[PDB]
């Protein structure tokens, strides 16, 4: 129940990445979540390969690389593959390539994941604070989202149907307006040094709590 959290303060969050024209938000959200679990378990912060997912977690996992995917099935891949690579060994090139996974350069591992219940921002607050950063889908289809610079983001035409993957690294409030602290993979020059604060407890605003999920290492 702590009023506000920020996983950057605990050293569990990597640099803000840049997905470019390639629509791999799902991959970045997934690697982002795990990065923290890797830090909580081993004390090391290393950026995990988003490309490894784009190239290797494909048809079998209902994913289509640069044309979208799911964080849930990405975790499944990492479990099935018994590991993921470091971004340094398998870097991001913003396009669909052949699977080039090398276990020699295995950076981390995943044991299971957990899909949090639909639209429950209270449960999402619990997970974020107790378990760590949570991969979520949101409705980023509107210009206001692209244009976002600062403060608590609220779009009245935003639906609960999610198309874009992001990572909830914290929560809190600004002048009474509650927010979710979301790391976005759209470069450092998006919003607040690559982050966006989005309205919290305003009826699952933009589908933030629609499909939340987090991995775990054991
Ligand atoms: C082929 N295949 C699947 O597609 N799934 C599933 C993959 C995901 N699940 C979970 C449904 C929950 N959910 N519903 C709606 C929207 C999202 C969602 C969450 C985050 C983001 Cl970023 C997005 C956006 N993704 C896309 O727009 C997108 C995804 C894939 C793609 F190819 C193109 C676009 C959606 C979600 O997770 C259902 C079926 C399978 C499951 C099994 Cl056991 C076996 C084969 C499967």
Swiss-Prot record:
It is found in: Lysosome; Secreted; Cytoplasmic vesicle, Phagosome. The keyword Secreted applies. It is an enzyme of class 3 (hydrolase). GO terms for cellular component: collagen-containing extracellular matrix; endolysosome lumen; extracellular region; extracellular space; ficolin-1-rich granule lumen; intracellular membrane-bounded organelle; late endosome; lysosomal lumen. Its main location: other. One of its GO terms (molecular function) is proteoglycan binding. The active site is at residues 25, 164, 184. Its EC number is 3.4.22.27. Disulfide bonds join 12-110, 22-66, 56-99, 158-206. The keyword Protease applies. GO terms for biological process: adaptive immune response; antigen processing and presentation; antigen processing and presentation of exogenous peptide antigen via MHC class II; antigen processing and presentation of peptide antigen; basement membrane disassembly; cellular response to thyroid hormone stimulus; collagen catabolic process; extracellular matrix disassembly. It catalyses: Similar to cathepsin L, but with much less activity on Z-Phe-Arg-|-NHMec, and more activity on the Z-Val-Val-Arg-|-Xaa compound. Keywords: Cytoplasmic vesicle, Disulfide bond, Glycoprotein, Hydrolase, Lysosome, Protease, Secreted, Signal, Thiol protease, Zymogen. Belongs to the peptidase C1 family. Monomer. Thiol protease. Key protease responsible for the removal of the invariant chain from MHC class II molecules and MHC class II antigen presentation. The bond-specificity of this proteinase is in part similar to the specificities of cathepsin L. This is Cathepsin S. It comes from Homo sapiens.
């Amino acid at each position: 129940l702590p009023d506000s959290v920020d996983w950057r303060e605990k050293g569990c969050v990597t640099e803000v990445k840049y997905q470019g024209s390639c629509g791999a938000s799902w991959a970045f959200s997934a690697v982002g979540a795990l990065e923290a679990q890797l830090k909580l378990k081993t004390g090391k912060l290393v950026s995990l390969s988003a490309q490894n997912l784009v190239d290797c977690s494909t048809e079998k996992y209902g994913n289509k690389g640069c044309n979208g995917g799911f964080m849930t099935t990405a975790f499944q891949y990492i479990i099935d593959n018994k590991g993921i690579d470091s971004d340094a060994s398998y870097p991001y090139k913003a396009m669909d390539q052949k699977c080039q996974y090398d276990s020699k350069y295995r950076a981390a591992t995943c044991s299971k994941y957990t899909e949090l219940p639909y639209g429950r921002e209270d449960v999402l607050k619990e997970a974020v604070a107790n378990k760590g950063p949570v991969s979520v889908g949101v409705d980023a289809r509107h210009p206001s989202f692209f244009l976002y610079r600062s403060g608590v983001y609220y779009e009245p035409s935003c639906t609960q149907n999610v198309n874009h993957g992001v990572l909830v690294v914290g929560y809190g409030d600004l002048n009474g307006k509650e927010y979710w602290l979301v790391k976005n993979s759209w470069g450092h020059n998006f919003g607040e040094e690559g982050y966006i604060r989005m309205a919290r407890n305003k009826g699952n605003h933009c589908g933030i709590a629609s499909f939340p999920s987090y991995p775990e290492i054991l």
